[PDB]
Amino acid sequence: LKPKILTASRKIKIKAGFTHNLEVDFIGAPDPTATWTVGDSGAALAPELLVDAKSSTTSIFFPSAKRADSGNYKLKVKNELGEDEAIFEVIVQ
């Protein structure tokens, strides 16, 4: 079952020293693989916030978001031969 990621994916206006709740969804299986990256063509995100993910979906946290968090949260999921991806430009104010 290829991953059908429908998460709108666009941007994320978070504030500094704030908490965000990133959400996403994708029908991938069996047991697909979703990676939460941060643009940069190789950069990733997680240790600068919280992150969660499910086989047919995924969502990550930003309870510790700050000006630095200002990055391009790019997530890419897959599943054997099915592949999907959602771009999330996250900024902080």
Swiss-Prot record:
Gene source species: Caenorhabditis elegans
Lineage: Eukaryota, Metazoa, Ecdysozoa, Nematoda, Chromadorea
Post-translational modification summary for this protein: Phosphorylated by mak-1 on the protein kinase domain and/or CDR domain in vitro.
Disruption phenotype: Body muscles are unable to develop or sustain normal contractions but small regions within the myofilament lattice of individual muscle cells contract transiently in the absence of contraction of the adjacent lattice. This results in a nearly constant body twitching phenotype. Resistant to nicotine-induced paralysis.
Note: Determination of the mutation frequency of the unc-22 gene has been used to study the biological effects of short duration spaceflight.
Residues of the full protein shown: 4148 to 4240 of 7158
Function: Regulator of muscle contraction and relaxation. Senses mechanical strain that occurs during muscle activity by unfolding in clearly resolvable steps at differing forces. Plays a role in the organization of sarcomeres in body wall muscles.
Description of how the protein assembles with itself and partners: May interact (via protein kinase and CRD domains) with mak-1 (via protein kinase domain).
Protein name from the UniProt record: Twitchin
Stated family: Belongs to the protein kinase superfamily. CAMK Ser/Thr protein kinase family.
Tissue-specific expression: Expressed in body wall, anal, vulval, and pharyngeal muscles (at protein level).
Localisation per UniProt entry: Cytoplasm, Myofibril, Sarcomere; Cytoplasm, Myofibril, Sarcomere, A band
Domain of life assignment: Eukaryota
